[PDB]
Design a protein around this ligand. Structure first.
Ligand SMILES: N=C(N)NCC[C@H](O)[C@H](N)C(=O)O
Ligand SMILES: N=C(N)NCC[C@H](O)[C@H](N)C(=O)O
Ligand SMILES: O=C(O)CCC(=O)C(=O)O
Ligand SMILES: O=C(O)CCC(=O)C(=O)O
Ligand SMILES: [Fe+2]
Ligand SMILES: [Fe+2]
Lengths: 327, 327
C-alpha cells in the first residue's frame, strides 16, 4: 500500500556525498539559507530518485513514499541522544541534511513554534521516564494512530521520517481510509462538521524547553470539523485516535467515529524503517503511529529524524514563515 | 508589485535548447509522458532561473513571477492562428514545451474538460467575430479583471502566460487585494460566505469544438462562497468582475462587493508581456485581465500560450487527472 524505491549503492553514495557537502557549506539545516537552497540543491540528487519522487507523489493510491538503502555508520553516528534537545549531534548532521534534501523534492518544509523549540528537523527517540506518554518519545506504550497535527488546518501534507537506527526492527503503523467497510450513512456523517480534534501533547509547554496561547484555544474551544474531506471515492482523512471526539452530545457523529476507530484498528498495518530507510507518509490519505517497544537506554535506542512538509507554505500564512503558530 | 527575472542571452539559449530537445523527443506537450517528465527535465534549466523560481514562489508579496528574454523568431514562429483549434503550429511547438518546463518548477499543470478541448497548454489570441466577448479571444472589448476559474474550488494557484508575439505592446492588467482601503466591516463581510461566483463563458459548449453538466450546475445553482480567505493581513482573493454577485437579497454583501469593484478598478495596473516574456500570475493574491485592443487579423496578432498550475493536483481529486471537470 506504499510506493517503494531502493537506492543502488552508487546512488546512495552520491546522495550521501551531496548531503555531506551541504553539511560542510551551511551552518545548520534550519537556517534561512539552507531552507531556501535545499529544493534547488536537491535537483542534483540521482536522477532515478528524482523521477521516483516526482511520479510517486502524483499517483492516486500510495499511503507513503519509501526510500530504502541510505548507508548509516553506527560508529560515525555515535550514541542515541537521551533527549531531543541534545540530539543535533555531529554524527547525525549529514543525515539531517539528507532528509531535508529529499523533503525538498516533495514540498515546503516547516516546523511548529510549540514543538521541539520550533525546529524544522525534529527527533524521534525514547526519553527515559516518558515511556507511557502520548508523544513520539514514548516506547512501552504504543503510539496510537493519528493524522499528524490533526487539530490544525495547517498540518503537513507529508511527514518525513529517516531511520538513523532501529536495531530491533520496531514497526511504524499505518492505515488508510477503510472505504471497503464504511457504509454510506456513516461516510455521510464523517464528511460533516461534527467532530472535535484537540492538539496533541507534543504542543504543550512541558514538552518544550505566545504561540502556546493558540494551542490552549484549540484545546479549550475546538470548533467542529469533518473527519473526511474531498472525493467520496478517495477521501482525505483527519483524525487522531487519542485526541478526537464527537461534537457535544452528537451521538450519530459519535457512532460514526466509534465505527471508524474499529475499522482503522482492524486495518492497521506495519512498516519497518530499518537503519537508513526514509518514509514520506501521506498525511491526508493515511494515519500513522508506532508499535510499543521496550526501550534500551544503553546508547543504541531507535532514533529517527523527522520533518513536516506542505505542498504550499502560503496556505498557512495566518500562522507564520517556516515556524508556525497562532495566538 | 511582481517579481522579475531577466535571462542572459546564454541562459535563454540554454533554456530554448532544452525545450527544442523535448520537442524532438516527445510527441506532444499534453501527452502523459511529457506531463510526468517535464518537472524532472526542468531540473536541467539554468541554475540562476531555478533559484529565482524556488525563492520567488516563497516570497510573501509578489502578484506574479515574470521571466523576460526568451528569444522568439517571428519567421520561424509563423503566422498567428485564426483560432485556438489550429494553434498548435510547428513554429509554436518548442515554446509550448518551454512554458511547460518553466511551469513544472512551480507545480502541477492541468486543464479543464470544458475549455479548449481539454488541452493543458492553451492559446490566447483574437478570434474574428469574437471581439466583444467575455473570453480571452476578445480584443476590442477589454477583458475585465478576474480570478481565473473563480467559480471552481480547483482553480489554479498560478496562471502561466508566454508571449509568442505582442507587436503593439498590449497590456495585461493586474490588481491585488486593496488592503490599504478596505475598512474592517467591509473586510469582515468579504470573508463571509455571501457571494455567488458563476463559471465564465470559456467553459460553455459553444466555445469548444458530461463535464459541461457540472458547469451548468455551477451556473444555475451556485453555492454561496467568500471572496476573501486566509490571513486578514494578507488575504487570498476569489472574484470575477463579470461573473460575481451577492447572495440573493444580501445588500450588505452587495455593498462590500460594490466597494471592492471600485477599489480594484482604481488600483488596476499594467504589465506588458513583450515577445518572449513569461508571467506566472499568483491566482490567489491577484486578479488579472487584458486591455482593449484593435485586432489586426493580418497574421501578426498578439498571441500567448497559457497553462494552469496547481501546487497540489490531489486537492482536485473529485474533479479528475490532468483534465478537470465534474457532473
Ligand atoms: N497524535 C498523537 N496521538 N500523538 C502525537 C504524535 C505526534 O507525532 C507528535 N507530533 C509527536 O511528535 O509526539
Ligand atoms: N473571467 C472572465 N471574466 N472571463 C474569462 C477569462 C478567462 O481567462 C478564461 N479562462 C478565458 O480564457 O477566456
Ligand atoms: O516512531 C515512528 O515510527 C513514528 C512516530 C510518529 O508518529 C511521528 O514521528 O510523527
Ligand atoms: O491576454 C492576457 O494578457 C491575459 C488574458 C487572460 O486573462 C487569460 O489568458 O487568462
Ligand atoms: Fe506522528
Ligand atoms: Fe484570465
Amino acid at each position: 500500500p506504499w510506493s517503494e524505491f531502493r537506492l543502488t549503492p552508487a546512488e546512495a553514495a552520491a546522495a550521501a556525498a551531496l548531503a555531506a557537502r551541504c553539511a560542510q557549506r551551511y551552518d545548520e539545516t534550519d537556517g534561512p539559507e539552507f531552507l531556501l537552497d535545499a529544493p534547488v540543491i536537491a535537483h542534483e540528487l540521482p536522477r532515478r530518485l528524482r523521477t521516483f519522487m516526482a511520479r510517486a507523489r502524483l499517483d492516486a493510491w500510495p499511503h507513503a513514499l519509501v526510500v530504502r538503502g541510505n548507508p548509516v555508520d553506527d560508529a560515525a553516528l555515535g550514541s542515541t541522544p537521551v533527549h531531543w534537545r541534545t540530539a543535533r549531534t555531529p554524527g547525525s548532521r549529514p543525515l539531517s541534511f539528507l532528509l531535508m534534501l529529499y523533503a525538498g523534492l516533495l514540498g515546503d518544509v516547516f516546523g511548529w513554534a510549540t514543538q521541539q523549540d520550533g525546529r524544522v528537523v525534529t527527533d524521534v527517540l525514547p526519553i527515559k521516564g516518558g515511556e507511557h506518554t502520548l508523544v513520539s518519545s514514548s516506547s512501552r506504550q504504543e503510539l496510537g494512530w493519528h493524522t499528524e497535527d490533526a487539530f490544525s488546518p495547517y498540518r503537513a501534507d507529508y511527514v518525513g521520517l529517516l531511520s538513523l537506527r532501529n536495531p530491533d526492527g520496531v514497526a511504524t503503523t499505518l492505515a488508510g481510509v477503510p472505504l471497503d467497510d464504511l457504509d454510506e450513512r456513516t461516510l455521510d456523517v464523517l464528511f460533516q462538521e461534527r467532530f472535535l480534534i484537540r492538539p496533541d501533547d507534543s504542543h504543550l509547554q512541558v514538552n518544550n524547553s505566545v504561540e502556546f496561547e493558540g494551542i490552549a484555544q484549540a484545546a479549550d474551544r475546538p470548533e467542529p470539523v469533518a473527519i473526511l474531506t474531498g472525493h467520496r471515492a478517495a477521501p482525505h482523512l483527519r483524525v487522531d485516535g487519542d485526541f478526537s471526539a464527537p461534537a457535544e452530545g452528537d451521538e450519530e457523529a459519535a457512532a460514526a467515529l466509534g465505527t471508524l476507530r474499529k475499522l482503522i484498528d482492524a486495518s492497521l498495518y506495519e512498516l519497518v524503517l530499518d537503519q537508513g530507510d526514509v518514509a514520506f507518509i501521506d498525511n491526508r490519505r493515511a494515519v500513522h503511529g508506532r508499535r510499543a517497544f521496550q526501550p534500551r537506554y544503553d546508547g543504541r535506542d531507535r532514533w529517527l529524524k523527522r520533518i513536516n512538509i506542505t505542498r504550499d507554505l502560503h496556505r498557512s500564512r495566518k500562522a507564520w514563515s517556516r515556524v508556525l503558530g497562532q495566538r
